[PDB]
Amino acid sequence: GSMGSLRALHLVEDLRGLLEMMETDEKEGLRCQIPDSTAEVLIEWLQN
Amino acid sequence: SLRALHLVEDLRGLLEMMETDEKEGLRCQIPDSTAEVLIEWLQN
Ligand SMILES: [Ca+2]
């Protein structure tokens, strides 16, 4: 590991936590603003 | 929205610089319930 992957671990935890405080339209609106390329990298990493 | 957008961008930038063993070792440390929430959110 590294301090960068420790950072990544905390970003993931923060993102799940923030998602809990969002309403449906806010979560969809957030996802709508994320480039599909960024989403794809995250999906495949989580599904690997 | 701005903070979460930055979180997602920073995360993508970190993952793209990682070797395969680093990315997969990091995935090992993510709870399955967290991974499932994020996957379903990203795929809709
Ligand atoms: Ca499910």
From Swiss-Prot, chain B:
Shown residues in whole-protein numbering: 45 to 88 of 969
Name this protein carries in UniProt: Liprin-beta-1
Q: How does it assemble?
A: Forms homodimers and heterodimers. Interacts with S100A4 in a Ca(2+)-dependent mode. Part of a cortical microtubule stabilization complex (CMSC) composed of KANK1, PPFIA1, PPFIBP1, ERC1/ELKS, PHLDB2/LL5beta, CLASPs, KIF21A and possibly additional interactors; within CMSCs KANK1 and PHLDB2/LL5beta seem to be the core components for recruiting microtubule-binding proteins KIF21A and CLASPs, whereas PPFIA1, PPFIBP1 and ERC1/ELKS serve as scaffolds for protein clustering. Interacts with KANK1 (via CC1 domain, residues 244-339).
Which domain of life does the UniProt lineage start with?
Eukaryota
Q: What does this protein do?
A: May regulate the disassembly of focal adhesions. Did not bind receptor-like tyrosine phosphatases type 2A.
**Family according to the record:** Belongs to the liprin family. Liprin-beta subfamily.
Task: Tell me the domain comment.
Answer: The N-terminal coiled coil regions mediate homodimerization preferentially and heterodimerization type beta/beta. The C-terminal, non-coiled coil regions mediate heterodimerization type beta/alpha and interaction with S100A4.
Give the location in the cell. Answer: Cytoplasm, Cell cortex
Q: Which organism is it from?
A: Mus musculus
